[PDB]
From Swiss-Prot, chain B:
Name under which the protein is recorded: Surface presentation of antigens protein SpaP
Membrane protein topology class: Multi-pass membrane protein
Cross-referenced InterPro entries: T3SS_IM_P, T3SS_YscR-like
Subcellular location field: Cell membrane
Function: Involved in a secretory pathway responsible for the surface presentation of determinants needed for the entry of Salmonella species into mammalian cells.
Chief localization: membrane
Swiss-Prot record, chain F:
Assembly with partners or alone: The core secretion machinery of the T3SS is composed of approximately 20 different proteins, including cytoplasmic components, a base, an export apparatus and a needle. This subunit is part of the base, which anchors the injectisome in the bacterial cell envelope. Forms a stable homooligomeric complex. The complex is composed of 15 subunits.
Family: Belongs to the bacterial secretin family. T3SS SctC subfamily.
Protein's recorded name: SPI-1 type 3 secretion system secretin
Gene source species: Salmonella typhimurium (strain LT2 / SGSC1412 / ATCC 700720)
Subcellular locations according to the entry: Cell outer membrane
Task performed by this protein: Component of the type III secretion system (T3SS), also called injectisome, which is used to inject bacterial effector proteins into eukaryotic host cells. Forms a ring-shaped multimeric structure with an apparent central pore in the outer membrane.
Disruption-associated phenotype: Insertion mutants are hypoinvasive in the HEp-2 cell assay.
From Swiss-Prot, chain I:
Name assigned to this protein: SPI-1 type 3 secretion system needle filament protein
Annotated domain remarks: Deletion of the last five residues prevents self-association and yields monomeric proteins that allow biophysical studies. Forms a right-handed helical assembly with roughly 11 subunits per two turns. The location of the negatively charged surfaces are radically different among the needle filament proteins PrgI, BsaL and MxiH. In PrgI, the major negatively charged surface is not on the 'face' but instead is on the 'side' of the two-helix bundle, and only residues from helix alpha1 contribute to this negative region.
Cysteine pairings via disulfide bonds: none
Regulation of activity: Binding of bile salts, including deoxycholate, to the PrgI:SipD interface may inhibit the T3SS function.
Impact after mutating residue 54 to L: Non-invasive phenotype
Outcome after substituting residue 4 to A: Decreases invasiveness. Abrogates host cell invasion and effector secretion
Keywords, alphabetical: Protein transport, Secreted, Transport, Virulence
Record note on what altering residue 62 to E does: Can secrete only early substrates. Can assemble needle filaments in vitro, but shows a filament assembly defect in vivo. Can invade cultured epithelial cells
From Swiss-Prot, chain K:
Protein's name in the database: Surface presentation of antigens protein SpaR
Gene designation: spaR
Source taxon at top rank: Bacteria
Upper classification of the organism: Bacteria, Pseudomonadati, Pseudomonadota, Gammaproteobacteria, Enterobacterales
Function according to Swiss-Prot or TrEMBL: Involved in a secretory pathway responsible for the surface presentation of determinants needed for the entry of Salmonella species into mammalian cells.
Locations listed in the record: Cell membrane
Entry's family note: Belongs to the FliR/MopE/SpaR family.
First and last residues shown, out of full length: 1 to 88 of 263
Spans through the membrane: 12-32, 46-66
Amino acid sequence: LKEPVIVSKMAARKKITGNFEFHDPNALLEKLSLQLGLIWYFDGQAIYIYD
Amino acid sequence: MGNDISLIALLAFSTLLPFIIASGTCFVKFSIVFVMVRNALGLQQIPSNMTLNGVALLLSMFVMWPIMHDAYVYFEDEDVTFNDISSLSKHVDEGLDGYRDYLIKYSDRELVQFFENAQLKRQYGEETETVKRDKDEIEKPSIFALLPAYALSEIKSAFKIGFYLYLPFVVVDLVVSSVLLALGMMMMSPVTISTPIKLVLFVALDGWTLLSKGLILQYMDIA
Amino acid sequence: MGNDISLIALLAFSTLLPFIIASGTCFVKFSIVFVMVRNALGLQQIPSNMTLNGVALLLSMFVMWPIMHDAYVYFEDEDVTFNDISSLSKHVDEGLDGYRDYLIKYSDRELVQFFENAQLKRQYGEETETVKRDKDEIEKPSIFALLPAY
Amino acid sequence: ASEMRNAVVSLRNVSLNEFNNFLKRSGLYNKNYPLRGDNRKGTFYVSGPPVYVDMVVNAATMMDKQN
Amino acid sequence: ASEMRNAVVSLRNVSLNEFNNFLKRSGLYNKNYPLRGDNRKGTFYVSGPPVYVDMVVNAATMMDKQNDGIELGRQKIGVMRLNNTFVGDRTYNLRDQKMVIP
Amino acid sequence: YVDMVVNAATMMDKQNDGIELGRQKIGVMRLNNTFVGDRTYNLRDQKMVIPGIATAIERLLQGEEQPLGNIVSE
Amino acid sequence: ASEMRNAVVSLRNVSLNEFNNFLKRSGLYNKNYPLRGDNRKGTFYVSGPPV
Amino acid sequence: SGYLDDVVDNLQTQVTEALDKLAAKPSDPALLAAYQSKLSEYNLYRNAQSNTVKVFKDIDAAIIQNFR
Amino acid sequence: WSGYLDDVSAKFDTGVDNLQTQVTEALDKLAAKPSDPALLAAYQSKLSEYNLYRNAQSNTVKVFKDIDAAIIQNFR
Amino acid sequence: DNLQTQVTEALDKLAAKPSDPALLAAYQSKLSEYNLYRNAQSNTVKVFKDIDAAIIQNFR
Amino acid sequence: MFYALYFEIHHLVASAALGFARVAPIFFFLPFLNSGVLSGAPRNAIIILVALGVWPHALNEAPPFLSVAMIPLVLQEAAVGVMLGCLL
Amino acid sequence: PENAVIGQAVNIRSMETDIVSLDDRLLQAFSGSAIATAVDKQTITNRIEDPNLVTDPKELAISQEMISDYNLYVSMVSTLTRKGVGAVETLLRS
Amino acid sequence: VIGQAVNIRSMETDIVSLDDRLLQAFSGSAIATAVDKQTITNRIEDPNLVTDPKELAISQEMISDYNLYVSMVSTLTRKGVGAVETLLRS
Amino acid sequence: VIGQAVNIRSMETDIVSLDDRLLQAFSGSAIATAVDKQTITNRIEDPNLVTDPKELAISQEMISDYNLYVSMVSTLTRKGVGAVETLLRS
Amino acid sequence: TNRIEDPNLVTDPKELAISQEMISDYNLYVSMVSTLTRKGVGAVETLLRS
Ligand SMILES: CCCCCCCCCCCC[N+](C)(C)[O-]
């Protein structure tokens, strides 16, 4: 992603497993957001992720 | 500081603190166990109660600290301000779950349920029957029911331990008498010889280390 | 005038003093041995519990009073300076090492280490203990860990 | 990363374009964490490492009073 | 290293270039921790060892209040001749009466 | 050394605050081309008064707070 | 020796040369612990035994 | 004081000085008007000091009594 | 070096720029020729203006002392 | 701090011309209102913190 | 000097207080002084009076211990009192 | 400042971790309370020695609050400490 | 505006110099020096300074502090004796 | 009058144990107290209300009622805790 | 009470100067007795309750 990422404490409780390919991160990120129930934002300096 | 009533609540709690420690905490078990060990060895004044209770209080502090710290951090959190009685009360209740869940592992289900049945408003006929789902019934019985069931079950489990501690010394006390009778010295009191044997056995067994460790292991998990 | 918190600490300490003496001082040993010997001689109430406890108390002071006096002489020292809560904590902890050393001398390393684990490990997701190299922790077992082990 | 800070600032005498220039001459300017706003107006948003955010907020708010 | 200290300072009467010269004449300047700012303005930032930072901030703040008695606003006189009219308030006499114009 | 320097400097400073350094001087300036006093003319049907330089300058400066500078046509 | 004491003193009417003469006529003056300052001015330093 | 022992001016001086100047000519309005505000500010200072000293001592007395 | 009731007096003394001297001047001129109606008419104005200046100044400082003393009384 | 600002404005306008009756009339009002405001605020602050002290003294 | 009597009363009570530490343990050991016999309001009133009857220095001059850490001192005196209680 | 608002991105708290000992958790409290009180007392004193603070209603209103907050803070620390040692004493003499 | 400064990175305490005066309850030497001065004085200077508001504000500090110091010693001795009696009975 | 609204229906709950009866009485008092304190604070700083005799006559009562109510709750709580302490000590 | 109602006594400057003393003495007498009795019972409480 070429940006620092900040994860909210409540989101950090969730767990994930498997083999992943970071080929296109923005498209992967939005899909997982929808599957896991996260919300995210980007100010231009860092990506923020919340439950 | 803060809400004037929250301040009153904090001071009331801190006033009742020693009776809670004395009635709803593992201190109840450790206090009994150490005194029973002294009686099993047959000492009337050694160690002092002031030493035994000091040790028991320290050992209990380790077990209880993590719950007090977690509840403190949970309330020292600016996250929200509350719209309504139902929102505030359910926020309060969700903070005690750590303690409620500590009491639930050790009180006994049938006695707990009997006490919960006891609180309900009386009826003229016998009360209308109910069955309730686990998220109240298993997960969330009320604390004014849990607390005495805990105290009673703890006392019981303490007596049980004391029983096992007595057995080897009883064996000693009998054997030594039978050997003195085999030597014919029928008139000598055997207490004068059995007591030091008991002490030797206890130090070679290192009973204090074992007791202090295993009692903590019943509540903590250490690796 | 002085500092209002150091006043609280002084008054509090002086209320706990007899329980500390009764549970973390050689008084524990002296008061026991005498009473045992008295029972073994087979004639209770000679000497009196008053005689025995009185002597045991007096002897304990020869051992312990120099350590307390050394600590107060450490704190009454006009040349120190501090900058932060950490720098003050360190200096106050350093003041207690004279007592800490006595407890370390007369107690078991492994029972001390067990309680040192037990204060934390209910927190811990892990089994590794090497994660701090010993030289700090071996010197700095906490006093609440040392007391019951002593 | 979890320490990032940010602030929002409003200047009553000094335009954003006036301030960026000062940062450049100072050599404090940092293209990885630029200020974000309207060069014409005087309100902006900034975020970054805490010593940087604090330095910016203090310099801008003092210089707003000097002018 | 962790003991570094940082501060922002904002003078009113003493430009940065005014203060640099004082440091140099004093023999207190240090090229590893120079002041960062606009020589023209009076606001700067400083970071470094404690003693250095404290000395800088103190000296600057004293210089500022010392120079505060300097008075800089001044009045001037302009002389202007009229070429086409009488300067003063002007009287005419009518047959029996004076009358006057501003 | 530090304590002696500090106190000596502060007290020498305070012993001078009462000293005054400003001063006033007097300039005598002859007018080469005109009468100093206010002029007045008496005529058959009129009286006319003209203020002098002193009168006009005083009337201009009266009450001024700021210093002067740049007259143009420690 | 570690009981030696120091002070700085600042006169408003009198001056150091005025005061030395007093000590002299008194027979109090001590060349081991003289007053240190500017004879013309009225401020000086003194160090010595307490009395 | 003229004295320091090694190891600005306050309202107490300014009042004594303004009283001293006034008493030379009790009927001058500039001096009277200069003295009213110094005597007022000295009255306020000297009340506020004593009231806060009193608060700090009652705090310490309450602590000692609470641990009796 | 001064408090805030001096800031409040000085707001009058710098507010009425010059009156404090203008009065003395007017008196110096009138004393020389008491029977002159233009001088008399001028002095009446200056002296009245000065009388009001002083009264308004003193009553304002009195009121601010009454506010302060009441706040300090609550420090108890 | 609006009522704190208004009174300092009024005072400057008055000090500019102490004899103007319209200015005097305005200032009288502004100063009186400010005077009541300060007292009311101080008294309620006191009441609110005397209640806390009485609570602590009740369990102490 | 106006306050001298006030200070002279405070020097008295500071001396009595430091004497109590050494006299009270004796009252604990002896069989006709212990609290099985002498109890309630008389007890302190009498102990203090005795301590003032035996303090060795003039009561009206400042106590010499104002410069010293109080706890080591109090424990020292109590230990001495326990030793005297045994010997008597 | 007044023309600026400054947040924290997300308030993670390393000091929420319990990891230190029951006694280090005590020394922190003691050291922090002692420093906070000495600083507060000094500030209150300065606000009274300085003549422009002790004579302006705006400043007096603030000093009143500082004094009351100091009082309440110290009184509560004292109370809770007494209650604490009193619990120990109640249990061990039983 | 004038002379403004602020320390941005760290909370280095500056309103006070942090010092061993944190670590004591009473400045007993400052008491012993003040108590000296108000007791060595016997027929020198003058009596009865009930009336000057500058010295009368210095007496208030001493009259309070010595009363507190004496009150504290009274409790410490009782505590000490009580601790000895507690151990000897038990 | 202008921009005004009221909540018609309160949310509701079961009350089945002394635990819930206690939390409910606590939560009921906390909120009423916070609301009252805020209301008073606003009435002290709206300048139409600080300076009008009719509005001041009301604020006086509100302050009094607040004082009395919080003093009652404090007293009865301390009496209850003291009765428990007395019985268990006995 | 009777002095306060005789209109001759209540309006003559000579007589008022007397009434003021009489009321000041009554006030001091009753405050004295009410203080010393409270000290007196406080002694009995101290000896018996203690
Ligand atoms: C008896 C307790 C009270 C007094 C304190 C005694 C401290 C111990 C001094 C022991 C000195 C022994 N010596 C002379 C061999 O070093």
